[PDB]
Design a binder for these strands. Structure first.
Lengths: 99, 86, 95, 111, 98, 86, 108, 96
DNA sequence: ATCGAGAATCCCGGTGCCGAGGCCGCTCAATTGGTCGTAGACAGCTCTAGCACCGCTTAAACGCACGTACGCGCTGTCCCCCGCGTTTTAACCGCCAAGGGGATTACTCCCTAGTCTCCAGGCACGTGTCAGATATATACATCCGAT
DNA sequence: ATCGGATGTATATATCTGACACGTGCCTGGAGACTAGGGAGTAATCCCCTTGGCGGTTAAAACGCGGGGGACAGCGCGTACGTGCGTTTAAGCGGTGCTAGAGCTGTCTACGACCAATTGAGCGGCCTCGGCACCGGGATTCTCGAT
């Protein structure tokens, strides 16, 4: 008798897990290739220490995570429970991100 | 060989479930459809500023290798200070 | 040979022995506290710099550090910092 | 010479390096002259702050069933006091994660 | 006769005027007494230069006015054209003012 | 003598003045309890700025607060204000 | 044997006064030769175009004296000068005429 | 006994104004705003020179550190023309 | 309305292993002890600029009516995104190779603090206009009914 | 959907008046010509730590497929606040007085750099085992589909 819990049990339970855990999410080699690719524009043929790639990973996840905190408060303040891109644009504008 | 190394998503790397995992660390229940492309854009802008500023610190010492102190200092200057590396 | 490097780690370990004497600490947390002590240290050092620059002085004394701690430390955190500070100035000076 | 070769921290009754902090005040170009008892005062302030954060990570360290402070306990140790959070509100700490916050509309609308 | 106007013509024309002009527009003696009465708590028997009261007036107008910028974008993002105190609370939390 | 009935300094921030600052901000319509919270927010901001200015003024051991005092105090809170020196 | 004149600087901005201000703020222990020339050149550039945009945006108010309103919108109109000064209030500045488009009264 | 003084940039700001739009004056509040503006940028760039010299184990602020610190503060286009005028003034200085 | 699969989550138990903690040499930065110009507490004046006070006009603030439009709750309707099996597929991991570049130590040397005097650049200080606010009278631009 | 009061707003013209651009004087900080120790460019090397490749497994990513609930447009109904007019009313002004304290300048003095010998103290190398993972098994709890 297959029966999925619902739209929200995987969500809220998985929010309890991925808030509860500590480790770094987005994978090492695609992120590393990303930083090298953006790095090629300002200067050719760079080199990275590995821990610096972990550092850009950590600040990048913390900045995105804080952005989803705030855009979540944005869309909840519209009596919605779903992030939509104009909410992202709002928090980037409200915070001051929007140049 | 490379066995299908075609990174493909030139920058998509941050797969759709990876942005899901960061959003669910942020406490986000339901994610719309165009969120992912804009998320790649915002992450791209943030990394462009951070390593644009970091590569200049690596250029001033006339060194060809970016270190961890480089990016922690350049993060500090943008008001986003990050301990645990120096 | 290998260049010697400084830290704070044995001091943070000593205050850990003072507060909860039978309790460990991990290594990356020790580097967190190290960078914390450096961060606060350049905060009140810089506040002492321009706070001493405003009054046409050229000397950092303990009154300046008392003012600058009363600028960065939020409230209840300022007061016990000033009580421990005066206790350490006077407790130093009595010798 | 000799003259009871004593250090300092014990001249003030502390456990912080007055000489090392003192050298660091003279060698960052903060003032051309640096007074007599300034790093005594400043080492006192940093000892109080260190004792506060390590204290709350100790209380949270028992209260999440370990015997060793990890940086996660520094995350929710710092972010639970109001004033320590206000001193460190612009500071990310690595391997910290997020203190568990759930908005009220996300919790289920059960009976 | 009626003549009157819509609720919003005086508003929008008023936005053209008060965005257009620049002068200081909270009255100087109630503001001055306000700064002195807030100032009595930390220390007593004070004295102020006048231009410092002008300067706190500038910080008051800059911080409040910018807070209505972000509060207004908050309420417009709710498909509302009228701000409400929860929007003030939202922009204050987004700027990190708690 | 001249009517001096002026109690509650905070209330002295008039409802038309908060209206006028909202008009400069580009706010069309103002709800009911906006004014209470507006006096509260202005009260908090002036409490922090005045506290730091007094701290800047007791350190010079002077009874009179100047304008350079509070331009310094606004600079340190990341709200720098030109037009009064420094 | 001191048969010389006084002319030296011959450029733009006080190299000696800025040089004093680099030496007497405790930044390094010592300050090189070419540096206040460099910093003076940068500040003359920034000063130059900010006064230029206040120049055209002063002529648009048909005046001859630049008031701080002209520095307000003269900064806030260009992107880069705004991003250099995005945390800085200008006294007697006011705002640019920003109006959100939903407030514009539409009709037939 | 007269009194003291205290320098400014107002004559110099007046001179650059005479370079750009020469028959067009300036008011005093805007003059003091420009004055504290150039003190603000002066302390940002000198401060960044301090934080940048304080990393490379060096205790000397030459012009190259001001080049890097300008290439960190000023965004983009005016960084390019700013640094280009800086090379114009170093090279125009020393070639004399 | 209230009760069972059952699946995720929490409670002990041996294992291991390795990273946390500790111990032994050991360079060097703290330390101690004198000097010394000097920055700065300290006294006293001064005068000036902040505070106090009183009367008059009045712009502005206050307060009553009123109406409509803005907020907001219900209703339906669609679809986009959540959830879960199935494939694949590229990330992770171990190890092996090569050298380019970071860190080190030394070498040499130009260069920027430091001194003393010399003078004009800017800066305090009268000064008198031409730019702008302020009426002041005057013809457009758009609002708002009422048609 | 047009037309007209009307009405707030843009357009010359004087007019005082005063804030700014400017001329006089001065004095001290810019500068100019030396010296000197040291910070740093510059060479060369040590080696190590970044890069690269290659094979083996596979957790994760991709993707197809339900399906339902969440966004959102309509819509009716209340209320609260914008608009405008009579009342007040204290803010601005504008002068007048008084002296507390910013600021100046001088007095005298306790205190931080300069060296310079002396040493244990924190730091790196190098062990060593106990706490956290970590399977591994097992009872609890909560959810979701039933009554």
């Amino acid at each position: 008798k297959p029966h999925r819990y619902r739209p929200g049990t995987v969500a809220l339970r998985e929010i309890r897990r991925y808030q509860k855990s500590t480790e770094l999410l987005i994978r090492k080699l695609p992120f590393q290739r990303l930083v090298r690719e953006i790095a090629q524009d300002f200067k050719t043929d760079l080199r990275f220490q590995s821990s610096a790639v972990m550092a850009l990973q950590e600040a990048s996840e913390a900045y995105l995570v804080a952005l989803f905190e705030d855009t979540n408060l944005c869309a909840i303040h519209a009596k919605r429970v779903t992030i939509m891109p104009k909410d992202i644009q709002l928090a980037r504008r409200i915070r001051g991100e929007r140049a | 060989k490379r066995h299908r190394k075609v990174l493909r998503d030139n920058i998509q790397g941050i797969t759709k479930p990876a942005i899901r995992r960061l959003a669910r660390r942020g406490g986000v229940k339901r994610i719309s459809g165009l969120i992912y492309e804009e998320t790649r854009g915002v992450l791209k802008v943030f990394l462009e500023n951070v390593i644009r500023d970091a590569v200049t610190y690596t250029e001033h010492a006339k060194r060809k290798t970016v270190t961890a102190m480089d990016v922690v200092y350049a993060l500090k200057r943008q008001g986003r200070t990050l301990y645990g590396f120096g | 040979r290998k260049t010697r490097k400084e830290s704070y780690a044995i001091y943070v370990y000593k205050v850990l022995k003072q507060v909860h004497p039978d309790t460990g600490i991990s290594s990356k947390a020790m580097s967190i506290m190290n960078s914390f002590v450096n961060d606060v240290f350049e905060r009140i050092a810089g506040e002492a710099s321009r706070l001493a620059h405003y009054n046409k002085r050229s000397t950092i004394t303990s009154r300046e550090i008392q003012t600058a701690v009363r600028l960065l430390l939020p409230g209840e955190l300022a007061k016990h910092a000033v009580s421990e500070g005066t206790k350490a100035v006077t407790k130093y000076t009595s010798a | 010479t000799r003259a009871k070769a004593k250090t300092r921290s014990s001249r003030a009754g502390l456990q912080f390096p007055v000489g090392r902090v003192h050298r660091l005040l003279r060698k960052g170009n903060y003032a051309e002259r640096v007074g007599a008892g300034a790093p005594v005062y400043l080492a006192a302030v940093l000892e109080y702050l260190t004792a506060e954060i390590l204290e709350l990570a100790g209380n949270a360290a028992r209260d999440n069933k370990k015997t060793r402070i990890i940086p996660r306990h520094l995350q929710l140790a710092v972010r639970n006091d109001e004033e320590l959070n206000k001193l460190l509100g612009r500071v990310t700490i690595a391997q910290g994660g997020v203190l568990p916050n759930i908005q009220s509309v996300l919790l289920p609308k059960k009976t």
